[PDB]
A paper describes a structure:
We then solved the structure of α7∆ICDcryo with a 50-fold excess of the E3 nanobody, with and without 100 µM nicotine, with an overall resolution of 2.6 and 2.8 Å in the ECD/nanobody region, respectively, and low signal in the TMD. Five E3 molecules are bound in a similar arrangement to the one seen for C4. Surprisingly, the conformation of the α7 ECD in the E3-Apo structure also matches best the agonist-bound conformations, including Loop C capping and Cys-loop outward motion. At the orthosteric site, the conformations of all binding determinants resemble the ones seen in the E3-Nic structure. In the cavity, we found a well-defined small spherical density, which is located where the electropositive pyrrolidine ammonium would be. The density would be compatible with water, or more likely, a cation such as Na+ that may contribute, along with the binding of E3, to compact the orthosteric site in the absence of nicotine. Yet, Cα rmsd calculations show that E3-Apo slightly differs from both E3-Nic and C4-Nic, with locally 1–2 Å deviations in the loop C, as well as the top and bottom regions of the ECD. In conclusion, our data point to a striking effect of E3, which, in the cryo-EM conditions (high 50 µM E3 concentration, 1 h equilibration period before freezing in the grids), stabilizes by itself an agonist-bound conformation of the ECD through long-range allosteric interactions at the top of the receptor. In addition, E3 shows a unique interaction between the Arg56CDR2 guanidinium and both the main chain carbonyl and the first glycan grafted on α7Asn23 (pre-β1), an interaction absent in C4 that harbors an alanine in place of the arginine at this position. In addition, we show that E3 alone stabilizes a conformation of the ECD that is characteristic of agonist-bound structures.
Author numbering:
A (entry chain F), G (entry chain J), H (entry chain G), I (entry chain I), J (entry chain H): 1 to 122
B (entry chain A), C (entry chain E), D (entry chain B), E (entry chain D), F (entry chain C): 1 to 207
The structure:
């Protein structure tokens, strides 16, 4: 919803589970798809996971296909990225971006700018 | 400025080609009605009825919605032709060369997503005028309206009673009334049922 | 060049879809007036009055403003149709097939943001012409103008007296004056009030 | 939403200029047929037949296909004029000033890529009306349709029987049937053969 | 290719909305002239003169200039409507429904920036025809041309003598000459003076 | 797909504004010819000839060329109006209100770059009709075609004999033949000579 | 107003306050929205705060949501970015960009080019 | 087909052959052209090989023109990049990009976003 | 004029003056505006000064507002950037770019590509 | 012609001459203009020389104006960049790009993608 902020990042050990939160502010959360992205210290920004505005469509990167899950909750205006056993290359800063009535796809052109992300270190 | 912000935000990812439903499995309900302002010409030789009509289409987009608190002072927006989805309602029994005789105006959308489209036009429809009872003939002129490319599985056309509160009386013809009926017909092109709304003009020759 | 720089600067962030008000909770005041050049034809059989008319619309954009010292020599700019916001003033009682019979010209804007729009056109409007008094009948022909998609909450339509100095006398019909009045009507389509201005041509058949 | 995803995916790399075949060496088969709704005017003086006709064109794009499981609820899409490839079928013996008298509607495509197109129109075609047997003349009015820029090597125009289910009887003319035939003709413009389908209206004057 | 390079180079930073002067403080001089090919119709009942006319507009852009040595073989370029600035000269006393009855052709520009524009058209202008001297009436038909949105402060409209060498004699009407005059009128719309050129057809009824 | 690849490659760097020559110093040779299908009417009162004609323009682009081995199965491409350069051939003696009465179809280009363009249209041209020898008059109707903005230095217009094989007999008028001639005329507009081709219909009234 | 110039930077300690000024030149200041951006030498340019042309709409990045305030003053043709307690993450060069009648949003396409920013160090 | 994932990378010696697999998921594989791209540790992304949606058109970079071959198999929804004798210059991460009914060309605009590639080292 | 070449760079001490020349070739110099840009060893290209095609409009970066002047001379087809007392921050490679009948503004979408600039060091 | 490949690079000493070749494959060579570009180890790509599709128009960068020449030969489908006395600043990787019926200009939007270039070192 216009402004999306990520939270819940921290330092974990390999194989541990981490839940990332994305809170909405500045609009109606149910009108926007939520897309998650990573940026490594020296790498480019990459897609991770997405959920559609209705939650019926989800997309995942292949590395996180079986390990990350995405969920929505309109009551708290929050999108949750659940993370099962994490691995060294999951260490990066995660940003959350809105897509106005998006389809929950990996296409970057349908998303707005990310907020200020949260660092996850494994 | 909140109008600028709302206009920028609404068109994000918006596709005018897409029927604006929230499920893609249930039809979009489009309410259709007429406003007869004048019967302009009843051509007995050419078998053509010329009327001044404002069409009325109402539907829900579900993609053009906003919170009036986040956009203070902006309760409605207007979209021109080709910028948002519109129903392709056409006059089936059109005698006009251009077929679609309506004038494209703005579509009015409010915060809940309700789109109101009120096209004015001069419509030329085909009518069979019986001059057998020459001085006292009651004529029934059908105006059949419906979507050309959307069936009843995609566009649920519902009928609302026509408005004659702005009718300017004719000199030669008296308006008995304009009843409307909604039907669903199968055409030889297609296996999809096609709903239509037919309004019958039902005039009488004045003494 | 200062004109080039001004055009580039003015078109920045500008949305033609947006009503150009500084405060979205306030109506935009649009001054509307007429300029009758000649009465082309009075069709007694078709109940249609044909006139040559220049419309006059004036409003304030508040988005197209500049400092003449910062743009020396550039006191006015001109914008074509579809590049800036324009009022959708239409002839309600239009007998023309295209309904909108006006010719779209440039909108003239000066430094303070005052946009003036003078579209010429041959207007065909419906008129009830009485032949009961035949030789010396006075005929009142109504020309009703108003915004189609903007109500009084969004577009405040003010009326100015019709211009007559450019009129050229007709052969069969004598003009006694064209008074205009502003009303606020309610329609069955929505609860939104709609202001309109109506000019009555008020001709007399010449001896 | 799956309609948005499907439209975005379908418009990818799509060129409306390109004939939608999968080999480029075999012709695209286009099935053409007619739907007569009304013989509106048989002008004996001007030798022009005016008819209300819905054309029917069917072909396969092979570029607009999708899996309904991956796009649940989306079994059909509709594309406006200029967004996808369409056959340039024209009325060769057209008496209309605009030549192409048809009204451009949406093209309907289903999951297997079958595009189906029903342009309605009022068609004015040249017809030799012979008034030798004034009350018992049988008149054969030819309606010749074919692609203008595509020959038989590129567009294989197949013929389907015309539809008379929706025909509305005329006042002065009986319809005895509309036989159609497909023939490939050679023109002096190029060595390219051009297929065409001709429907003969074959009316009879009523008593 | 030098013509390709020139077309790429000329449209750099070019704004068709901008009046192509070098100072913005002095008017652009536009030379306007007429070319009467034939008087197609003199309608005494409708008081309308129908003529076949080629307009001639000439001006200097100062933005479309090049060195013929740097672009060998390219002495002229041609620009369609909407790609470069054109004067908005209109027929004030136009009896045509679309008002602007001219056909938009290419604007021809040579290396020094001189743009020359020759739109042909069938012009319908209002004319008062006196039937007093039935076989010996000399009729003065006025054709008034001028810029609609540019005044004398911005567009200095100069007059050139009408071309007659291409005229083909009419049957019923004899042409005695078409003199033109340039005036500068004031309108109630604004304090801006507007120059205009008026050509009087001045026909004579043939025996 | 080879057709898709060919279209993408052909549209590269292409400018429709550019005359498609390889030297820019030698004229582009455009071959022009006629195909008379039928004479719709011969208006003696309005002095207007109404005919159905397919124009034929042929030229070489030199920018749309490809190797059929590198694009197997793609021997021709078709380009719509405004996507590639076309000659601006116009009917000088046009009596139509729109002047250009032709219908814009696709331009057909083959591998060696030969573009061929066959626009159909109902043409209304001014003709002098003599009723002196009322039942035995031979009427010479002139049809003058030429480029409007390209002279002989840029567009070399060559003439080809008109096509009659598709002509259908007229009821009132016999076609004795349509000879064409190519001339180069000078106009007062510029020192540029303008080639033109004129076809004379040369009809005879039937007994 | 066409040309916006930032000033008022310097070196401050953590938890201190700092006021940044943006002066206008080359146009009418009331016709332009003012946006603030950080360059963060090792990072990319990021949105900080915005004020609409009328001053009725403000946008803030989440990191500075409760700590930075933005204000306008047309008398001096200036936009003020006030900064409460600062953090080492705020050390960067701040640039000021105009937006013709902008809405005070975080969209980069709405703003003009930034000027030559001023470095602040915490 | 919407989502393309490369696999089969590893470490090899110069002159050794290597086969790279590219699995499709999320759509119909026969409707998409597959394009192969490299990225070296320090370098820009570069085209390698392509195959059209029908397999009738193939494109290769000149360095790999005579050494790499590309093939399709619709049964397993896979695209295979066969590699003959490799060189130290081939050490990079290879990614797959779908192109909806693409012509098997080297134009980047025709292709979708690459997935998460696989590293090969020579 | 189509091709613009900078010259006159060198090494100077702080507080000195320096004149940079920009010669035109390949077209008519009076039809083009001249823009100056600074590249810097590690920074991005930034606008410095501009002059309109007629010389009636000039734009300067705020750092060089009171120190750099720009002038035109059509006789030699040259544009001169005069530099008063220079500062260590004015150490970079300067490029000269043409704008077809440009207004002398700082907008980058109006100029063509720079030539090969000249290094100045302070 | 669709695909252009550079060749002939190597190691040379300052003041020596060098000829670079550009071979065409995949189309008609006479329908395409040929542009030359340098990449350099740490700099951006820069225009060097160009020839039109007919060979009647050539463009050169100023540094190589009097030292580099460009020529075409349709018999071997080749474009030759002749290099007179070479200088250390010419050490770079040269790429060759086609432009469909190009005018032999320096505009980058007119050319296609370069192939894989050849390194020259001085
Ligand atoms: C937007 O307009 C719609 C329709 O005018 C309003 O919908 C109301 O509820 C039904 C839903 O279709 C309509 O039939 C009613 O006529 C509408 N009004 C009432 C009083 O029920 C909707 O409330 C409007 N939204 C806003 C925010 O004003
Ligand atoms: C721009 O033009 C308008 C209208 O011509 C001028 O507006 C003044 O105030 C009202 C409208 O608010 C007009 O009716 C008056 O005629 C105008 N006052 C005058 C002319 O004294 C406005 O001043 C003009 N702005 C300029 C010239 O900068
Ligand atoms: C899409 O529509 C086409 C035509 O309506 C279907 O094609 C079938 O095969 C021929 C047409 O080539 C018809 O005679 C059949 O009646 C069509 N239907 C069936 C069931 O065979 C095609 O199957 C449709 N594809 C869908 C619905 O996915
Ligand atoms: C471009 O055309 C113009 C007008 O056709 C030429 O202008 C000359 O000066 C006036 C018009 O301002 C005419 O009376 C002259 O006859 C024009 N020609 C000459 C030779 O003086 C202008 O010279 C042309 N520029 C060219 C050909 O480069
Ligand atoms: C493309 O078409 C042209 C013309 O149709 C072919 O060139 C010849 O053109 C002349 C006159 O222009 C005709 O008389 C010849 O019949 C044409 N053909 C031959 C073989 O001379 C040209 O060959 C065609 N290119 C193809 C088919 O690749
Ligand atoms: C969409 O409609 C189908 C049937 O029409 C229904 O089964 C399904 O639950 C609907 N989806 C939602 C989200 O309500
Ligand atoms: C609109 O916004 C207000 C406050 O921002 C909030 O209380 C209200 O719930 C919102 N409306 C909807 C429908 O979410
Ligand atoms: C906008 O208008 C509303 C009502 O007209 C008023 O209450 C409000 O104060 C106005 N806002 C401004 C900033 O003028
Ligand atoms: C216009 O500019 C001048 C000087 O640049 C200034 O004095 C004047 O106040 C400006 N006008 C407005 C309305 O700000
Ligand atoms: C395309 O058609 C040609 C002949 O029409 C045939 O030889 C060829 O096999 C076809 N291509 C495919 C892929 O079927
Ligand atoms: C459509 O998808 C389903 C499951 O995703 C699959 O079983 C089926 O084969 C697909 N259809 C086609 C034609 O590939
Ligand atoms: C522009 O015109 C004004 C007055 O018309 C004049 O004072 C000024 O010098 C002119 N500018 C140029 C550059 O000639
Ligand atoms: C055109 O170019 C030639 C040589 O390139 C030069 O001598 C001449 O002065 C130029 N013309 C103008 C008007 O500058
Ligand atoms: C172009 O034409 C001119 C004369 O028309 C001629 O001198 C010149 O050689 C031609 N150029 C080419 C490349 O053939
Ligand atoms: C077309 O290509 C074939 C083989 O690729 C070649 O032999 C032939 O010369 C080419 N045609 C032309 C005109 O270059």
């Amino acid at each position: 919803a216009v402004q999306l902020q990520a939270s819940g990042g921290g330092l974990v050990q390999a194989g541990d589970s981490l839940r990332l939160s994305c809170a909405a502010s500045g609009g109606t959360f149910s009108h926007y798809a939520v897309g998650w992205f990573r940026q490594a210290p020296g790498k480019e920004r990459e897609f991770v996971a997405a959920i559609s505005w209705s939650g019926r469509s989800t997309s995942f990167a292949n590395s996180v296909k079986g390990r990350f899950t995405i969920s929505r909750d309109s009551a708290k205006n929050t999108a949750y990225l659940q993370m099962n056993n994490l691995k060294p290359e999951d260490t990066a800063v995660y940003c959350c971006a809105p897509a106005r009535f998006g389809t929950g796809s990996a296409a970057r052109d349908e998303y707005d700018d990310c907020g200020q992300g949260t660092q996850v270190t494994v | 400025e909140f109008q600028r912000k709302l206009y920028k935000e609404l068109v994000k990812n918006y596709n005018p080609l897409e029927r604006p439903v929230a499920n893609d499995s249930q039809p979009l309900t489009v309410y259709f009605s007429l406003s007869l302002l004048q019967i302009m010409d009843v051509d007995e030789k050419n078998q053509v009825l010329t009327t001044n009509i404002w069409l009325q289409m109402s539907w829900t987009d579900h993609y053009l919605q906003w919170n009036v608190s986040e956009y203070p002072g902006v309760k409605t927006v207007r979209f021109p032709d080709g910028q948002i989805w519109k129903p392709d309602i056409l006059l089936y029994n059109s005698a006009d060369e251009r077929f679609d005789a309506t004038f494209h105006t703005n579509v009015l959308v409010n915060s809940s997503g309700h789109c109101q489209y009120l096209p004015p036009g001069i419509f030329k429809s085909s009518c069979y005028i019986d001059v057998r009872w020459f001085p006292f003939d009651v004529q029934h002129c059908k105006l059949k309206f419906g979507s050309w490319s959307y069936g009843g599985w995609s566009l649920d056309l519902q009928m609302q009673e026509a408005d004659i509160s702005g009718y300017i009386p004719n000199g030669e013809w008296d308006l008995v009334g304009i009843p409307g009926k909604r039907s669903e017909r199968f055409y030889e092109c297609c296996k999809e049922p096609y709903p239509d709304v037919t309004f019958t003009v039902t005039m009488r020759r004045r003494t």
